[PDB]
Amino acid sequence: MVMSLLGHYNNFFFAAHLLDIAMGVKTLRTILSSVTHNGKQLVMTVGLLAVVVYLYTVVAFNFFRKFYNKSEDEDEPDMKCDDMMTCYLFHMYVGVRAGGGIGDEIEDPAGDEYELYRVVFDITFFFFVIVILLAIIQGLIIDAFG
Amino acid sequence: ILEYFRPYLGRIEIMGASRRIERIYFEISETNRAQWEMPQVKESKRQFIFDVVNEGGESEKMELFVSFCEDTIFEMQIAAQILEVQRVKFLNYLSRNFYTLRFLALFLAFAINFILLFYKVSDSPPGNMVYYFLEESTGYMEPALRCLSLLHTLVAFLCIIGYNCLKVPLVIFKREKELARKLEFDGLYITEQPEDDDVKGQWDRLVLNTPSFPSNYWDKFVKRKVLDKHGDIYGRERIAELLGMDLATLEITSIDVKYQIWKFGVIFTDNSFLYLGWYMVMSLLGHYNNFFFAAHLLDIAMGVKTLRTILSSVTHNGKQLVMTVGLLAVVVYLYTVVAFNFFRKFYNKSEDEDEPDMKCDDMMTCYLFHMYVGVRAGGGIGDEIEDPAGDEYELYRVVFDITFFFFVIVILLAIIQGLIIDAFGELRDQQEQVREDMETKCFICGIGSDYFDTTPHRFETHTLEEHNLANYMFFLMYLINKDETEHTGQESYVWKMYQERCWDFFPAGDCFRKQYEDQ
Ligand SMILES: CC(C)c1c(C(=O)Nc2ccccc2)c(-c2ccccc2)c(-c2ccc(F)cc2)n1CC[C@@H](O)C[C@@H](O)CC(=O)O
Ligand SMILES: CC(C)c1c(C(=O)Nc2ccccc2)c(-c2ccccc2)c(-c2ccc(F)cc2)n1CC[C@@H](O)C[C@@H](O)CC(=O)O
Ligand SMILES: CC(C)c1c(C(=O)Nc2ccccc2)c(-c2ccccc2)c(-c2ccc(F)cc2)n1CC[C@@H](O)C[C@@H](O)CC(=O)O
Ligand SMILES: CC(C)c1c(C(=O)Nc2ccccc2)c(-c2ccccc2)c(-c2ccc(F)cc2)n1CC[C@@H](O)C[C@@H](O)CC(=O)O
Ligand SMILES: CC(C)c1c(C(=O)Nc2ccccc2)c(-c2ccccc2)c(-c2ccc(F)cc2)n1CC[C@@H](O)C[C@@H](O)CC(=O)O
Ligand SMILES: Cn1c(=O)c2c(ncn2C)n(C)c1=O
Ligand SMILES: [Ca+2]
């Protein structure tokens, strides 16, 4: 009733009532419950992921600041890791969804003194974050549904 | 009278020589019941519940339990122990709150990193690179960092001191017990010999000559009885020389540095002591550079069972994983060889003319390019090099790209991921099965909760009155305290079979109710 009444002040509120179709049948209810079936393990896993990304951010901020220039125009640089908070947000927001790791969103380390360290950094990030943890997070929900 | 004496009545069931189940009643002392409730024995009980079914076999399950019953007793005894008076009180207070100190250390470590998350860098000095803070409340965080770091270091030192004062005697006790038991029952230094790869026995060999060898173990006549047992078929004089005992003494009418050396050697190989030392070293290094404190965050990784299972899933199947990655490297090397021999012209990564950047003019550069860029591409190496349209070698390039995509991306990576995922699933299944079996059957006689519960709350009564686990430990201590001449027939029977390390008196698939079901 409250949502229906609020619908008169702004029409789009009526869209909320569409959620009534979500619980209308057994299959959709099962799909919705599959998420909350294993909540505790999911929360702990995402916390572990956050901790690992924080460690990677610490290392990157200490050693690899020069490779985080996102500006294509000279005389107007856009540093992403001159602060710990900005670097951490960049790692959690762009790196996780990259699909290939953080290595395909920063500068090419070819010809640099720190080339091998950068290669190991990229490979280890790709292996630990993308391949393993995301797969476990997805598999928990899929197995619960099954 | 029954209501008053209920807490002091201990009841157990044993398996008699007459091939029947018997019930035994005895007295439980007040001091024993009071000591049974200390937190450290609760932690020991939890750890025993953890490891007894995780790796232990069904055939030895009783034996481990008996060993546990011994260790706890020793712990309780040392628990009775709690300007020199001030020092003793300080040490006792430190020993009493070890886990609280650990909690405080973890809390401080967690608090440090939140403040660390506010760092900033600049080229000019604050209003070579310069690191500083950007907190809005000026001066709020800069001294708090120093205070928290000092507190963290102090707490780490106190934790090390407490662990030294609390858990070392138990380790020494277990080491001495194992050595004495093995030496008496198997004569590993008499008939057999330790293996060359077993550094354990090689280091333990030093302590046999020590005059004060059984310092913590209760049995201070092990040397006498081992001499009596093994002195017949073997020379008595050399046996006495091996144990370093005076053969001229018989029952009738100042630092001992070797023992200290052995004790320090056995102490400095304990995992917990080394972990605490590493914790202290990292905390100390934190003062030279703040970010080192971040390492302490790893303590949260092992704090709970689920994260430990996640971590162990990686190392569960290490050998196959290593061999698979080696095979992947070999295949990529073959592809690199072919590419270097035939397809050099397609590896130009320079978008500006008159400044080319060849990637496969060397074998090493091409190999690194293939392993670094090609594997993570998602679509194979074909989407990172030049378009082969219109070239003489077009079909060969197409086959190259397709075969690389099929063999490297689709198959090998999927197998590598699936190994770890399957290991994690198997570990979870094993843990769930273990928990269910523990929660659905009686620990001692191994009879399911379906035979019971035919009457209300039958399983709970069976586990709380007839099969209670602490009653056996109370019975063992009661037998220890009592005099030998006052033992009854059943008590002497159990004592005799205990001294022979035979565990046939425990019920095995039988109970009082089942034997007398027909009354
Ligand atoms: C009869 C059923 C399939 C149905 C329709 C429908 O037929 N739409 C239909 C429409 C036109 C043509 C053909 C079909 C709509 C339905 C759905 C959309 C629009 C109109 C009716 C609903 C229904 C579900 C939740 C609501 F709040 C209201 C109605 N419901 C009722 C579901 C309810 O019975 C489930 C319950 O018995 C068991 C359970 O709780 O798990
Ligand atoms: C909030 C809760 C789920 C949680 C988190 C967390 O921060 N999740 C979360 C994740 C991301 C964002 C926000 C929140 C972490 C938690 C998990 C991972 C990383 C950091 C904290 C812990 C926790 C785990 C181990 C510890 F030693 C202490 C607490 N806990 C408590 C777990 C505890 O109940 C486990 C239980 O097994 C104890 C028992 O058996 O009695
Ligand atoms: C709980 C966890 C953080 C912990 C403690 C601790 O301080 N416990 C705690 C308990 C209550 C309150 C506060 C803290 C100690 C721990 C460390 C030193 C002394 C006592 C306990 C360790 C640990 C770490 C590395 C080691 F080599 C050995 C143990 N660990 C992690 C590893 C642990 O799993 C090893 C072993 O026990 C097997 C297992 O549990 O599955
Ligand atoms: C009690 C437990 C969940 C806990 C907390 C907590 O409650 N944090 C909490 C904090 C605030 C609010 C709510 C909850 C923290 C805990 C975690 C983070 C911060 C403070 C305390 C820890 C703990 C784990 C490892 C340490 F080194 C020290 C403490 N522990 C102890 C874990 C230990 O008992 C596990 C052991 O019994 C079995 C095993 O080894 O598998
Ligand atoms: C180091 C070890 C795991 C290894 C590697 C390797 O280089 N891995 C590695 C991977 C990548 C980088 C670095 C290291 C390869 C290995 C695997 C693949 C490619 C190259 C070497 C082998 C090995 C395999 C077959 C052989 F004929 C001889 C040795 N081995 C020894 C395997 C051997 O124990 C198998 C066992 O079954 C034998 C037995 O049953 O007694
Ligand atoms: C202290 N103590 C024990 O702890 C013990 C024992 N016999 C067995 N145990 C376990 N004896 C004789 C003993 O004195
Ligand atoms: Ca008598």
PDB file of C-alpha atoms in Angstrom, chain B residues 141-317:
ATOM      1  CA  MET B 141      46.340  10.045  13.509  1.00  0.00           C
ATOM      2  CA  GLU B 142      50.085  10.763  13.520  1.00  0.00           C
ATOM      3  CA  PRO B 143      50.671  10.074  17.265  1.00  0.00           C
ATOM      4  CA  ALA B 144      47.994   7.362  17.370  1.00  0.00           C
ATOM      5  CA  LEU B 145      50.074   5.408  14.851  1.00  0.00           C
ATOM      6  CA  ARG B 146      53.124   5.524  17.140  1.00  0.00           C
ATOM      7  CA  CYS B 147      51.112   4.597  20.239  1.00  0.00           C
ATOM      8  CA  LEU B 148      49.444   1.631  18.541  1.00  0.00           C
ATOM      9  CA  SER B 149      52.741   0.380  17.096  1.00  0.00           C
ATOM     10  CA  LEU B 150      54.418   0.480  20.514  1.00  0.00           C
ATOM     11  CA  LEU B 151      51.458  -1.326  22.078  1.00  0.00           C
ATOM     12  CA  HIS B 152      51.565  -3.990  19.355  1.00  0.00           C
ATOM     13  CA  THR B 153      55.264  -4.663  19.924  1.00  0.00           C
ATOM     14  CA  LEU B 154      54.790  -4.876  23.698  1.00  0.00           C
ATOM     15  CA  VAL B 155      51.865  -7.285  23.314  1.00  0.00           C
ATOM     16  CA  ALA B 156      53.933  -9.487  20.997  1.00  0.00           C
ATOM     17  CA  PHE B 157      56.707  -9.669  23.602  1.00  0.00           C
ATOM     18  CA  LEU B 158      54.199 -10.524  26.335  1.00  0.00           C
ATOM     19  CA  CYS B 159      52.666 -13.252  24.157  1.00  0.00           C
ATOM     20  CA  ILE B 160      56.088 -14.824  23.603  1.00  0.00           C
ATOM     21  CA  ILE B 161      56.796 -14.779  27.346  1.00  0.00           C
ATOM     22  CA  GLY B 162      53.402 -16.291  28.157  1.00  0.00           C
ATOM     23  CA  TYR B 163      53.767 -19.095  25.624  1.00  0.00           C
ATOM     24  CA  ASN B 164      57.212 -19.879  27.024  1.00  0.00           C
ATOM     25  CA  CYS B 165      55.772 -20.007  30.542  1.00  0.00           C
ATOM     26  CA  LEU B 166      52.703 -22.102  29.636  1.00  0.00           C
ATOM     27  CA  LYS B 167      53.017 -24.658  26.822  1.00  0.00           C
ATOM     28  CA  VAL B 168      56.704 -25.691  26.817  1.00  0.00           C
ATOM     29  CA  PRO B 169      56.424 -28.220  29.707  1.00  0.00           C
ATOM     30  CA  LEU B 170      53.675 -30.100  27.859  1.00  0.00           C
ATOM     31  CA  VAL B 171      55.907 -30.430  24.788  1.00  0.00           C
ATOM     32  CA  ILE B 172      58.802 -31.669  26.933  1.00  0.00           C
ATOM     33  CA  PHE B 173      56.449 -34.116  28.669  1.00  0.00           C
ATOM     34  CA  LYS B 174      55.180 -35.548  25.381  1.00  0.00           C
ATOM     35  CA  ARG B 175      58.704 -35.874  23.970  1.00  0.00           C
ATOM     36  CA  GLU B 176      59.961 -37.702  27.068  1.00  0.00           C
ATOM     37  CA  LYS B 177      56.881 -39.949  27.150  1.00  0.00           C
ATOM     38  CA  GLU B 178      57.276 -40.977  23.513  1.00  0.00           C
ATOM     39  CA  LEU B 179      61.014 -41.599  23.893  1.00  0.00           C
ATOM     40  CA  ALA B 180      60.613 -43.695  27.047  1.00  0.00           C
ATOM     41  CA  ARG B 181      57.712 -45.726  25.645  1.00  0.00           C
ATOM     42  CA  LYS B 182      59.512 -46.497  22.386  1.00  0.00           C
ATOM     43  CA  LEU B 183      62.793 -47.342  24.127  1.00  0.00           C
ATOM     44  CA  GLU B 184      61.152 -49.695  26.628  1.00  0.00           C
ATOM     45  CA  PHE B 185      58.756 -51.507  24.304  1.00  0.00           C
ATOM     46  CA  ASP B 186      60.901 -51.752  21.151  1.00  0.00           C
ATOM     47  CA  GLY B 187      64.500 -51.164  22.270  1.00  0.00           C
ATOM     48  CA  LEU B 188      65.149 -48.876  19.308  1.00  0.00           C
ATOM     49  CA  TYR B 189      68.615 -48.034  20.685  1.00  0.00           C
ATOM     50  CA  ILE B 190      69.248 -51.651  21.782  1.00  0.00           C
ATOM     51  CA  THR B 191      68.176 -54.118  19.078  1.00  0.00           C
ATOM     52  CA  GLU B 192      67.187 -51.937  16.112  1.00  0.00           C
ATOM     53  CA  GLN B 193      68.717 -48.594  15.113  1.00  0.00           C
ATOM     54  CA  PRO B 194      67.199 -45.287  13.980  1.00  0.00           C
ATOM     55  CA  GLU B 195      67.138 -44.512  10.279  1.00  0.00           C
ATOM     56  CA  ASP B 196      69.719 -42.082   8.925  1.00  0.00           C
ATOM     57  CA  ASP B 197      66.967 -39.770   7.638  1.00  0.00           C
ATOM     58  CA  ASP B 198      65.205 -39.573  11.035  1.00  0.00           C
ATOM     59  CA  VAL B 199      66.824 -36.538  12.652  1.00  0.00           C
ATOM     60  CA  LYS B 200      64.380 -36.980  15.554  1.00  0.00           C
ATOM     61  CA  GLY B 201      66.058 -40.053  17.030  1.00  0.00           C
ATOM     62  CA  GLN B 202      69.528 -38.812  16.103  1.00  0.00           C
ATOM     63  CA  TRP B 203      68.999 -35.683  18.198  1.00  0.00           C
ATOM     64  CA  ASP B 204      67.253 -37.649  20.960  1.00  0.00           C
ATOM     65  CA  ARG B 205      70.285 -39.951  21.266  1.00  0.00           C
ATOM     66  CA  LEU B 206      72.134 -37.229  23.206  1.00  0.00           C
ATOM     67  CA  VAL B 207      69.828 -37.333  26.239  1.00  0.00           C
ATOM     68  CA  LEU B 208      70.166 -41.044  27.090  1.00  0.00           C
ATOM     69  CA  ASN B 209      73.349 -40.464  29.117  1.00  0.00           C
ATOM     70  CA  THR B 210      71.753 -37.614  31.092  1.00  0.00           C
ATOM     71  CA  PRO B 211      71.469 -38.268  34.856  1.00  0.00           C
ATOM     72  CA  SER B 212      68.181 -36.319  35.007  1.00  0.00           C
ATOM     73  CA  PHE B 213      66.529 -37.737  31.861  1.00  0.00           C
ATOM     74  CA  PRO B 214      62.932 -38.178  33.135  1.00  0.00           C
ATOM     75  CA  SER B 215      62.475 -34.665  34.497  1.00  0.00           C
ATOM     76  CA  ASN B 216      58.801 -34.219  33.547  1.00  0.00           C
ATOM     77  CA  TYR B 217      57.662 -37.787  32.846  1.00  0.00           C
ATOM     78  CA  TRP B 218      56.382 -39.444  36.010  1.00  0.00           C
ATOM     79  CA  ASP B 219      58.028 -42.862  35.512  1.00  0.00           C
ATOM     80  CA  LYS B 220      61.454 -42.407  37.080  1.00  0.00           C
ATOM     81  CA  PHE B 221      62.354 -46.121  36.858  1.00  0.00           C
ATOM     82  CA  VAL B 222      62.310 -46.629  33.074  1.00  0.00           C
ATOM     83  CA  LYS B 223      66.075 -47.163  32.919  1.00  0.00           C
ATOM     84  CA  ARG B 224      65.969 -49.815  35.655  1.00  0.00           C
ATOM     85  CA  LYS B 225      63.200 -51.818  33.996  1.00  0.00           C
ATOM     86  CA  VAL B 226      64.683 -51.548  30.497  1.00  0.00           C
ATOM     87  CA  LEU B 227      68.004 -52.770  31.918  1.00  0.00           C
ATOM     88  CA  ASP B 228      66.202 -55.687  33.564  1.00  0.00           C
ATOM     89  CA  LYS B 229      64.295 -56.561  30.385  1.00  0.00           C
ATOM     90  CA  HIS B 230      67.115 -56.244  27.837  1.00  0.00           C
ATOM     91  CA  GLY B 231      70.115 -57.037  30.053  1.00  0.00           C
ATOM     92  CA  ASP B 232      69.864 -60.823  29.665  1.00  0.00           C
ATOM     93  CA  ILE B 233      70.610 -61.567  25.997  1.00  0.00           C
ATOM     94  CA  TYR B 234      72.889 -58.526  25.846  1.00  0.00           C
ATOM     95  CA  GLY B 235      75.894 -57.398  27.857  1.00  0.00           C
ATOM     96  CA  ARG B 236      74.893 -55.656  31.079  1.00  0.00           C
ATOM     97  CA  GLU B 237      78.024 -53.496  31.319  1.00  0.00           C
ATOM     98  CA  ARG B 238      77.590 -51.869  27.907  1.00  0.00           C
ATOM     99  CA  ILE B 239      73.883 -51.337  28.619  1.00  0.00           C
ATOM    100  CA  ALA B 240      74.795 -49.551  31.856  1.00  0.00           C
ATOM    101  CA  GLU B 241      77.350 -47.471  29.951  1.00  0.00           C
ATOM    102  CA  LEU B 242      74.702 -46.543  27.367  1.00  0.00           C
ATOM    103  CA  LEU B 243      72.251 -45.322  30.024  1.00  0.00           C
ATOM    104  CA  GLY B 244      75.021 -43.851  32.193  1.00  0.00           C
ATOM    105  CA  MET B 245      73.894 -45.465  35.456  1.00  0.00           C
ATOM    106  CA  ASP B 246      76.031 -46.744  38.337  1.00  0.00           C
ATOM    107  CA  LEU B 247      75.906 -50.545  38.159  1.00  0.00           C
ATOM    108  CA  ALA B 248      77.249 -50.826  41.728  1.00  0.00           C
ATOM    109  CA  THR B 249      74.104 -49.352  43.335  1.00  0.00           C
ATOM    110  CA  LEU B 250      71.082 -51.426  44.342  1.00  0.00           C
ATOM    111  CA  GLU B 251      68.040 -51.153  46.597  1.00  0.00           C
ATOM    112  CA  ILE B 252      69.226 -51.901  50.142  1.00  0.00           C
ATOM    113  CA  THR B 253      68.819 -50.418  53.629  1.00  0.00           C
ATOM    114  CA  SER B 254      75.261 -28.686  39.187  1.00  0.00           C
ATOM    115  CA  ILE B 255      73.478 -27.553  36.020  1.00  0.00           C
ATOM    116  CA  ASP B 256      73.730 -30.677  33.822  1.00  0.00           C
ATOM    117  CA  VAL B 257      74.334 -28.691  30.653  1.00  0.00           C
ATOM    118  CA  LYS B 258      73.666 -31.633  28.317  1.00  0.00           C
ATOM    119  CA  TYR B 259      70.006 -31.747  29.358  1.00  0.00           C
ATOM    120  CA  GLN B 260      69.698 -27.987  28.832  1.00  0.00           C
ATOM    121  CA  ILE B 261      71.227 -28.314  25.357  1.00  0.00           C
ATOM    122  CA  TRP B 262      68.765 -31.078  24.473  1.00  0.00           C
ATOM    123  CA  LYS B 263      65.859 -29.030  25.840  1.00  0.00           C
ATOM    124  CA  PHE B 264      66.824 -25.955  23.823  1.00  0.00           C
ATOM    125  CA  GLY B 265      67.280 -28.070  20.699  1.00  0.00           C
ATOM    126  CA  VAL B 266      63.850 -29.657  21.030  1.00  0.00           C
ATOM    127  CA  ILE B 267      62.283 -26.283  21.882  1.00  0.00           C
ATOM    128  CA  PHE B 268      63.718 -24.445  18.873  1.00  0.00           C
ATOM    129  CA  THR B 269      61.991 -26.870  16.469  1.00  0.00           C
ATOM    130  CA  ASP B 270      58.422 -26.219  17.643  1.00  0.00           C
ATOM    131  CA  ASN B 271      56.137 -24.643  15.045  1.00  0.00           C
ATOM    132  CA  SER B 272      54.311 -22.329  17.461  1.00  0.00           C
ATOM    133  CA  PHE B 273      57.513 -20.909  18.960  1.00  0.00           C
ATOM    134  CA  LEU B 274      58.929 -20.187  15.497  1.00  0.00           C
ATOM    135  CA  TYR B 275      55.653 -18.566  14.422  1.00  0.00           C
ATOM    136  CA  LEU B 276      55.692 -16.306  17.481  1.00  0.00           C
ATOM    137  CA  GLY B 277      59.310 -15.399  16.762  1.00  0.00           C
ATOM    138  CA  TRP B 278      58.409 -14.494  13.181  1.00  0.00           C
ATOM    139  CA  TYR B 279      55.497 -12.403  14.474  1.00  0.00           C
ATOM    140  CA  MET B 280      57.866 -10.531  16.797  1.00  0.00           C
ATOM    141  CA  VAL B 281      60.431  -9.985  14.037  1.00  0.00           C
ATOM    142  CA  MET B 282      57.796  -8.567  11.682  1.00  0.00           C
ATOM    143  CA  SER B 283      56.420  -6.315  14.425  1.00  0.00           C
ATOM    144  CA  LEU B 284      59.928  -5.017  15.156  1.00  0.00           C
ATOM    145  CA  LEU B 285      60.614  -4.399  11.460  1.00  0.00           C
ATOM    146  CA  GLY B 286      57.345  -2.464  11.307  1.00  0.00           C
ATOM    147  CA  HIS B 287      59.050   0.484  13.013  1.00  0.00           C
ATOM    148  CA  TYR B 288      61.622   0.900  10.217  1.00  0.00           C
ATOM    149  CA  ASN B 289      58.861   0.898   7.577  1.00  0.00           C
ATOM    150  CA  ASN B 290      55.196   1.028   8.556  1.00  0.00           C
ATOM    151  CA  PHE B 291      53.759  -1.103   5.742  1.00  0.00           C
ATOM    152  CA  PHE B 292      55.406  -4.229   7.186  1.00  0.00           C
ATOM    153  CA  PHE B 293      52.559  -4.294   9.721  1.00  0.00           C
ATOM    154  CA  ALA B 294      50.308  -5.392   6.841  1.00  0.00           C
ATOM    155  CA  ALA B 295      51.961  -8.822   7.031  1.00  0.00           C
ATOM    156  CA  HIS B 296      50.236  -9.418  10.375  1.00  0.00           C
ATOM    157  CA  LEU B 297      46.907  -9.398   8.517  1.00  0.00           C
ATOM    158  CA  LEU B 298      47.774 -12.922   7.362  1.00  0.00           C
ATOM    159  CA  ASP B 299      46.885 -14.061  10.894  1.00  0.00           C
ATOM    160  CA  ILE B 300      43.220 -13.710   9.933  1.00  0.00           C
ATOM    161  CA  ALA B 301      43.697 -16.201   7.086  1.00  0.00           C
ATOM    162  CA  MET B 302      44.190 -19.220   9.367  1.00  0.00           C
ATOM    163  CA  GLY B 303      41.746 -18.064  12.052  1.00  0.00           C
ATOM    164  CA  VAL B 304      38.723 -20.074  10.877  1.00  0.00           C
ATOM    165  CA  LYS B 305      38.102 -23.499   9.361  1.00  0.00           C
ATOM    166  CA  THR B 306      36.628 -22.421   6.014  1.00  0.00           C
ATOM    167  CA  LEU B 307      39.533 -20.183   5.000  1.00  0.00           C
ATOM    168  CA  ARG B 308      41.981 -22.899   6.054  1.00  0.00           C
ATOM    169  CA  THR B 309      40.117 -25.363   3.822  1.00  0.00           C
ATOM    170  CA  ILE B 310      40.260 -22.879   0.937  1.00  0.00           C
ATOM    171  CA  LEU B 311      44.014 -22.490   1.440  1.00  0.00           C
ATOM    172  CA  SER B 312      44.587 -26.254   1.706  1.00  0.00           C
ATOM    173  CA  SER B 313      42.630 -26.929  -1.492  1.00  0.00           C
ATOM    174  CA  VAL B 314      45.576 -25.509  -3.456  1.00  0.00           C
ATOM    175  CA  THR B 315      48.197 -27.789  -1.896  1.00  0.00           C
ATOM    176  CA  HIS B 316      45.958 -30.880  -1.761  1.00  0.00           C
ATOM    177  CA  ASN B 317      46.958 -31.897  -5.318  1.00  0.00           C
TER     178      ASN B 317
END
